Amino acid sequence: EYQNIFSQVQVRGPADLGMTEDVNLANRSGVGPFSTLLGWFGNAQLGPIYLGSLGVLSLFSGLMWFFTIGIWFWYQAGWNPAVFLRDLFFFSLEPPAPEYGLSFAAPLKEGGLWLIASFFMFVAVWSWWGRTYLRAQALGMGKHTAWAFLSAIWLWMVLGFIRPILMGSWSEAVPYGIFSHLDWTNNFSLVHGNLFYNPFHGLSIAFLYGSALLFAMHGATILAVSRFGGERELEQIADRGTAAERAALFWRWTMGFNATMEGIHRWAIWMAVLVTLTGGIGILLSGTVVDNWYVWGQNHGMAPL
Amino acid sequence: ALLSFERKYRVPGGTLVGGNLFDFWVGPFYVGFFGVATFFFAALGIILIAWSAVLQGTWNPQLISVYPPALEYGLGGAPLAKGGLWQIITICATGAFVSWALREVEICRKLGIGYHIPFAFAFAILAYLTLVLFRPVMMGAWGYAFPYGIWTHLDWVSNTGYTYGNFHYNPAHMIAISFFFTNALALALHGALVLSAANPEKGKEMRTPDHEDTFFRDLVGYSIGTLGIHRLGLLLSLSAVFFSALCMIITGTIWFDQWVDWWQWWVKLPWWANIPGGING
Amino acid sequence: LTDEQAQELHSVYMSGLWLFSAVAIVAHLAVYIWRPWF
Amino acid sequence: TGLTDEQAQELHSVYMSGLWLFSAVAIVAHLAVYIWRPWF
Amino acid sequence: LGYTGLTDEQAQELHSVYMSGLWLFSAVAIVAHLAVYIWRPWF
Amino acid sequence: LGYTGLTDEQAQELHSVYMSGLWLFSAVAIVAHLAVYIWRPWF
Amino acid sequence: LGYTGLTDEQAQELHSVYMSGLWLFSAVAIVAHLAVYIWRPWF
Amino acid sequence: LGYTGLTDEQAQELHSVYMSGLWLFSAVAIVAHLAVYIWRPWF
Amino acid sequence: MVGVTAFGNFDLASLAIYSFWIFLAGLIYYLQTENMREGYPLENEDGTPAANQGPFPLPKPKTFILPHGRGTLTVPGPESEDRPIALARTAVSEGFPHAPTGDPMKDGVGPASWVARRDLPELDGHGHNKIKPMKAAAGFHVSAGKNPIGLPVRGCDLEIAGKVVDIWVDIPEQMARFLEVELKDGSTRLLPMQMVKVQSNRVHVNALSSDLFAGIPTIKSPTEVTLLEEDKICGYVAGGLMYAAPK
Amino acid sequence: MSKFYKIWMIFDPRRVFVAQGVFLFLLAVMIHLILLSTPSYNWLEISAAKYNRV
Amino acid sequence: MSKFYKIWMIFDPRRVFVAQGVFLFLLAVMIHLILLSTPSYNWLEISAAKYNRV
Amino acid sequence: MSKFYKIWMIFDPRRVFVAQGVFLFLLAVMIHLILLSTPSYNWLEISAAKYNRV
Amino acid sequence: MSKFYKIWMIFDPRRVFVAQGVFLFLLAVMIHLILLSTPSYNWLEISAAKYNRV
Amino acid sequence: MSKFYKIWMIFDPRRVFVAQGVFLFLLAVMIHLILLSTPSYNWLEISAAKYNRV
Amino acid sequence: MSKFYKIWMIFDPRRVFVAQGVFLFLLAVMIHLILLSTPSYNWLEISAAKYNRV
Ligand SMILES: CCCCCCCCCCCCCCCCCC(=O)OC[C@H](COP(=O)([O-])OCC(O)COP(=O)([O-])OC[C@@H](COC(=O)CCCCCCCCCCCCCCCCC)OC(=O)CCCCCCCCCCCCCCCCC)OC(=O)CCCCCCCCCCCCCCCCC
Ligand code: BCL
Ligand SMILES: COC(C)(C)C/C=C/C(C)=C/C=C/C(C)=C/C=C/C(C)=C/C=C/C=C(C)/C=C/C=C(\C)CC/C=C(/C)CCC=C(C)C
Ligand SMILES: COC(C)(C)C/C=C/C(C)=C/C=C/C(C)=C/C=C/C(C)=C/C=C/C=C(C)/C=C/C=C(\C)CC/C=C(\C)CCC=C(C)C
Ligand SMILES: COC(C)(C)C/C=C/C(C)=C/C=C/C(C)=C/C=C/C(C)=C/C=C/C=C(C)/C=C/C=C(\C)CC/C=C(\C)CCC=C(C)C
Ligand SMILES: COC(C)(C)C/C=C/C(C)=C/C=C/C(C)=C/C=C/C(C)=C/C=C/C=C(C)/C=C/C=C(\C)CC/C=C(\C)CCC=C(C)C
Ligand SMILES: COC(C)(C)C/C=C/C(C)=C/C=C/C(C)=C/C=C/C(C)=C/C=C\C=C(C)\C=C\C=C(/C)CC/C=C(\C)CCC=C(C)C
Ligand SMILES: [Fe+2]
After folding, report:
1. Domain tally, chain B
2. What parts of the sequence cross the membrane (chains J, K, L, M, N, O)?
3. For atom 34 of ligand 3, which residue has the closest CA?
4. Which of B271, B272, B275 would best serve as a mutation to test chain K binding (most K beta carbons within 10 A)?
5. Quick one: which of B5, B193, A268 has its CA closest to I31?
6. Which residue of L has its CA nearest to A113?
7. String of b and e for H22-36 (b: at least 16 CB within 10 Å)?
């Protein structure tokens, strides 16, 4: 009856400071507080966190981006806290108007502040990517996390930087707001025909659904064989046990083919990086190569003529 | 035929319906009672899709479409050429999905593992039945379900969404989207981490789970663990599907207008409703 | 917190509560003099 | 918290000194604003 | 008896230097405000 | 202090070099502002 | 001092070569700016 | 310093060959730019 | 580039979609071959190499360097069971079950199977044992759950089989892994934490009847448990679900 | 009265100091913003009107 | 009062006091915002009308 | 007053100095941006209008 | 200046230098972008106007 | 200038060579694409115009 | 001045050189993009209009 969804007994010991392969220990912090609420589901320990040069750069730039958008929101509210709380989700930093092109001459109120915020965000995201790479390198691990993050960065860059340049206007980029970027998404679909008929849009959706499918399958499989210590997968790779064999045989008897305790993670990483990669390509093609995706589908055997 | 370790696991037991009858393998596949049911329903549904393509007059697999009955048939039967083939295919699909889940249950209990996988699959079956059975029944017509076509059910999605304006003002829809995005992010991170521990820099020893915990604590200051990450993956996927089912079940039944108009209860809250500034004032 | 400790914390909390209520009543009475709703 | 009675007394004395300094500055500021532009 | 590990003399010296810096910063700010108020008063 | 491991002389020397760099940077900035203000004053 | 393992002579030599490279880069940049300003001044 | 395991002579020889390649690449680029500028100048 | 086609209706979007189809076929091939590093070549039901092996060739070997001087692992490689299987064919044709010859739970077949893993304890990043009894662990205590120590243990026949004596703890993950149960004869067994339900007054083991607790494989060292012993214990307890259905 | 010091026995002084500093700054900013939003007591706008800056 | 002191045998004092402070501050802010909404009992606006600030 | 130096026996000077630097910079930037957003005290536009720059 | 050299007895010089580089570069870019945003002080556009480039 | 060879003591030649190759190829492709995008310097279109190919 | 060589005992030359290279290339690309984005100082269209190529 115990399904291993929530731990039924919780234990605590001395905090684990972590490994010291060649990490600069002077850049680590102390351990934070233990949380029982998190310990019901996963680990209770918080921290320590590594902060280095790239951590400082990313924190400064991200804080400046956040503060720039926030101060613009406070300006749009008229400095009234009540209006700020009421119209939160309705404020937005907009990119420069279409008649300014790619130039940097747009006024502060009409898109210059958007350029300042975008520069800060650019620095923050790229320094965080470098930080993931260097944190992997310090521990002697492979850089798989950096490359998956690079896929995510590819889609982000296409949305905010690459496509506006190819289209020749900053007005193509996404505004900084909660409801406003949803409106941007809907208007992007409406302007370019019907984004459903973008084939790379369909592939991106296929891989997002596939991530949900594969992650549910894998979480369920590991929880099902956790009675044999299947969660300790790094050891099941080195010394195969009955947990790995039972999981492989379940999926083999079900659908005719299986994975290993490492190949399944290869499937996982590719299933996610593919949604973001195909999405980036599909957005890049919209407006620069195809202006009306539904008509394109009609000409390519996807929609009735 | 068999994997190197498969022989000791193939033992006679764990069936729900039948006994030694249907207790055998066909190649790698296990085929119990529900294996037979699944095969029959799937084959019938696929051949009926092909016959609907014959009736429609197209052989392009991207143009084949099986439309539900028109709204004037209500919840009754329809002629085969007009709406009935869709109904038979829906019955076949429901039978195939349920038999697949029950076959998974039989395999689970033959191998001695927990029933997490059939439960997770039942979540997706329930989302499908919400779109194809429960919502059409509450709205009173089979014509509110989606057609069986590669690109025409996207037309169904678009028409249904734009009936209520911009559909991602639906709040349960927002929650479901957030769960989907978080799920994809977590899947990428988890696959990358296990691979980076098992495949370190060239010439190095394999990393330990301590190295994985250390990597995430260095990066973001918290590590959920291995059991934690698998629990989180199951829960994120199932929550996404549950909230998508909810946001569709309330859409044509409780809500009837633009969802952006739903978000106005917050703005019109009395103690700031008339303050003159900002966007809504 | 045992019985005596909890009772003492209780007493100090109510001393604070009554001082706060006294200041609030002073303010409310000042408003009633300055601009009454009654 | 691990503080003794004397430690708590001393810490509270210094805290109250700081609080009264802050309050005195605030009182002077409010007096100046009220003379400049009363709100009652 | 310090939770940060500083002694009494160390705290006194650190506070002395901190107050020197604070007064320098405040003096610069005061001069800047005087210049702005002469240039363009806000009262 | 045991805070960074520097001695008194090391801190003095490091601060001397840091202040040399700071004054060079400030002098360049002052010349740049003088040039801009002559070219296009903002007051 | 002990931060990077370089001695005094090593730091001096490395800085000498670095400054040679910096001055070469700056000279090329100066010539480029002179050419652009003659071609199309921005003041 | 030797962060890479190369000796002084090895670094000198590798840099000599690298500079030969760099100058060949630069010469080809210079000829290409001369041809394009004669064909269609951009100044 | 809007409407620029090299031939027919083939533009940059068509080029992109066909390039992606080629890439996806290659990626699927790579993923399957990477998954083929365990369990291959395929065997007949009598142990001999099967005539058929599949549409994908076996990948080139790769070597893992195990930590703490545990050796190396090269996969794919010669894989052998290294243990007797007490199963008999029920049919001359393939695709039918193999029936256990004796007691399946003692013999370790079916849902009671185990694998001949290494006979050494699992280590942590520093070289210590990963799993320790909470008594031997330094500074470990129960934090926020129902503490099982001292509770009676009830089997699937609703009969008392023992009492909880200790908790075995995964030191790096800081999670309880096993319950140590003292039987009536003053002997202790390990029970997987994922197979017990800790209630207010008892610990309930749905998989295992009270009489079967004495048949749980024992650990040869009271202070540590190896991977092989973990296989045996987990496999026995899980096989109880099918092989203790009556009583 | 005269014994409130015992609260520092109940609350860690550093946590209380951090929390009350944050609270004081946020309260002060909120009040200043409230004054800025009202047409009256917006000292910038009324200074502009008094000296005819527009 | 009678025996309410025994709640501290059940609850950690810090959590209760923190929750009480947050609740009190939020209540006061909400009530002040409600008063500022209506023209009545809006001290910033009635003072503007009284001294003819507009 | 005279006993304020004891604050350094509760608060780590490094953490305090970092937080103070961040706080002061953000406050200065916010005040400058508020002044820029106001038609008066926008020194760039004031100098533009005075010197007939547009 | 007076006794400020002891700040290096509290802070690691490397981290301070890195923070200074990051802060100064970001501030300089922000100020240049603000100047480019203003119709005056955009040196490229006023140079274009002076020499009748466009 | 005569001692730039010491760069290879601190930089791995293989990483530098791979990065340099990738960088040079991407730069060249980007410049060629920028030239093809402009109506001038699109050598195919202007050869067409020059040789009267429609 | 004349003593800045001492910075190299503080910072590793490898990290400094890679950071400097990335920074310089990004700054050059940024300034070139800014110049191209302005209708003036875009040398391609300046040359096109000067020689009547459109
Ligand atoms: C042209 C179409 C047809 C093409 C070919 C068709 C022919 C048949 C198909 C052939 C392809 C088969 C692919 C299977 C490869 C298997 C890879 C693998 O998982 O492991 C093996 C191998 C290492 O395995 P390992 O055992 O785990 O190694 C562990 C090490 O010990 C220690 O670890 P490590 O440090 O070595 O790193 C480990 C990592 C090593 O992986 C890498 O090194 C990846 C490098 C980055 C990708 C390159 C593009 C980045 C942007 C350019 C700028 C930098 C260039 C790269 C710099 C190189 C420096 C090393 O290996 C991995 O496992 C990574 C898993 C996930 C990688 C996700 C990559 C995301 C890329 C994001 C793209 C962003 C820009 C996209 C722009 C648009 C592109 C269409 O990894 C790889 O080889 C990575 C392959 C990278 C492919 C990039 C995606 C290409 C997208 C093209 C789509 C089709 C075109 C559609 C549009 C067309 C328009 C006209
Ligand atoms: C009316 C609306 C349109 C439409 C318009 C669009 C548009 C426009 C786009 C999508 C995109 C996507 N859409 Mg669509 N979409 C529609 C209908 C659907 C339906 C459906 C059932 O109908 C589905 C399932 C989807 C699904 C999808 C996704 C597969 C895809 C986004 C991938 C992703 O993860 O992005 C989320 C991930 C990212 C954006 C990457 C972010 C990476 C960066 C680095 C993160 C930085 C964090 C930042 C610093 C903040 C810091 C936070 C703090 C650190 C905490 N769409 C209809 C047709 N859709 C995108 C796409 O790829 O299309 C091809 C896209 O651009
Ligand atoms: C929007 O804002 C705009 C764009 C308008 C304008 C804003 C501009 C501002 C914000 C940007 C400011 C930029 C400044 C900070 C640029 C600074 C540039 C400096 C850093 C130039 C330095 C150049 C260094 C050169 C490349 C040196 C090269 C020398 C190396 C090759 C030395 C290595 C030699 C080897 C031998 C070392 C080995 C030594 C041995 C002993 C080991
Ligand atoms: C919208 O509604 C509006 C805004 C209109 C109205 C709402 C208003 C709100 C609701 C009212 C809130 C009022 C609050 C609660 C006011 C309370 C203010 C008091 C609590 C401020 C106290 C400040 C005290 C500080 C300044 C004291 C500082 C002194 C310390 C820094 C001294 C250093 C301490 C060291 C020396 C300790 C030494 C310890 C050693 C080891 C002995
Ligand atoms: C919307 O609201 C608006 C913006 C309109 C108006 C609201 C305004 C209010 C809410 C803003 C409140 C602002 C705060 C309260 C003002 C704070 C001012 C700060 C406290 C000034 C502090 C200055 C400190 C100076 C810069 C520090 C100098 C530090 C020294 C250099 C330390 C050096 C120590 C070393 C050298 C030696 C110590 C260690 C050795 C071993 C002895
Ligand atoms: C929106 O608001 C706007 C932007 C419009 C206006 C608001 C403006 C305000 C918020 C801006 C605030 C700006 C800040 C506060 C100005 C700060 C400037 C800093 C302090 C400049 C400091 C520069 C110091 C550097 C340049 C000196 C460097 C020299 C070193 C590298 C020398 C080498 C170090 C030696 C070798 C150490 C070795 C010694 C030991 C013995 C080994
Ligand atoms: C209490 O209030 C305070 C002030 C304390 C703080 C409040 C903060 C809150 C109110 C701020 C909330 C911000 C939220 C709404 C951010 C929302 C962001 C949206 C959702 C972003 C979605 C998409 C944006 C992405 C795609 C943007 C990508 C842009 C990059 C690619 C930038 C590329 C870099 C280029 C443009 C820089 C060009 C500048 C020159 C120097 C090259
Ligand atoms: Fe996993």
Report:
1. 2
2. 16-36
3. N4
4. B271
5. A268
6. L33
7. eeeeeeeeeeeeeee
Identify whether the C-beta of residue E2 lies closer than 8 Å to the C-beta of residue E11.
yes
Say if CB I107 and CB I101 are below 8 A apart. yes
Side-chain-side CA neighbours of residue A263 (13 Å): 21
Alpha carbon distance, N-terminus to C-terminus of chain L: 54
SS3 of residue A231 by DSSP: coil
A101 vs O contacts (CB less than 8 Å) = 37, 39
Task: Assess C28–K contact: CB distance below 8 Å, yes or no.
Answer: no
Q: Which residues contact N49 (CB under 8 A, 6 or more apart)?
A: none
Residues of L in contact with F5 (CB under 8 A): none
Q: For residues A44 and A34, is the Cβ–Cβ distance under 8 A?
A: yes
* 3-class secondary-structure state, position A195: helix
Q: Which residue has the tokens 């045992």?
A: C2
Give counts: helices (H), strands (E), chain E: 1, 0
Closest by CA to A69, choosing from L30, L15, H35, is L30
Task: Please tell me which of the candidates A43, A288, A296 has its beta carbon nearest to residue I1.
Answer: A288
The answer to whether residue K29 neighbours chain B at the CB level (below 8 Å) is no
Total Cβ atoms within 10 A of residue I47: 12
Give one word for K32, left, alpha or beta, with left for phi > 0 and alpha for psi -120 to 50.
Answer: alpha
Cβ atoms of I110 and I100 within 8 Å: the answer is yes
Number of domains in chain M: 1
Domain at O18, CATH number: 4.10.220.20
For ligand 4, the distance from its centroid to the CA atom of residue C1, given in whole angstroms, is: 28
Q: Which residues contact H23 (CB under 8 A, 6 or more apart)?
A: none
- Rounded to whole angstroms, the Cα distance separating A142 from A145 reads 8
Residue among F43, J54, L38 nearest E36 (CA): F43
Sequence-separated (6 or more) residues with CB below 8 Å from residue A217: B117, B120
Structure token digits, residue A247: 């999981």
Q: State the closest ligand 1 atom to the C-alpha of I19, by its place in the atom list counted from 1.
A: 2
Residue nearest to atom 17 of ligand 5 (CA): L24
State the nearest Cα–Cα gap between M13 and chain A, in angstroms.
Answer: 12
Give the C-alpha separation, K2 to M36, whole Å. 71
Quick one: residue G16, left, alpha or beta (phi over 0 = left, psi -120 to 50 = alpha)? alpha
Tally of CA atoms within 13 A in the half-sphere of H37 that contains its CB = 7
The rounded Cα J53 to chain-centroid distance in angstroms is 29
- Name the method of structure determination: cryo-EM
**Ligand closest to the CA atom of residue N9:** 3
Angle between helices A242-255 and B85-111 (to 10 degrees): 160
Nearest to A60 by CA among M30, B164, I83: M30
d(CA L12, CA K43): 43
Q: What is the DSSP string of K1-54?
A: --SGGGGGGTS-HHHHHHHHHHHHHHHHHHHHHHHHHSSTT-HHHHHHHHHT--
Two tokens, residue A255: 């659908």
Residue M20 C-alpha to ligand 3 middle, in angstroms?
16
From the list I4, B191, J7, G3, the residue with the least C-alpha distance to A263 is B191
Structure tokens at I47: 């142990």
Based on C-alpha coordinates, what's the Rg of chain E?
17
Look up the domain containing M41 and give its range.
4-51
Report how far ligand 4's centroid is from the alpha carbon of K22 (Å): 15
- Tell how far the Cα of J17 is from the centroid of ligand 4, in angstroms: 9
Asked if residue B1 is part of any domain, the answer here is yes
> Based on the domain organization, do B55 and B181 belong to the same domain?
no
Nearest by CB to residue L26, choosing from A67, A75, A108, is A67
Residue A148 and residue A142 in contact, taking contact as beta carbons nearer than 8 Å:
no
B146 φψ region: left (φ > 0), alpha (ψ -120 to 50), beta (else): beta
Domain carrying residue B222: 164-263
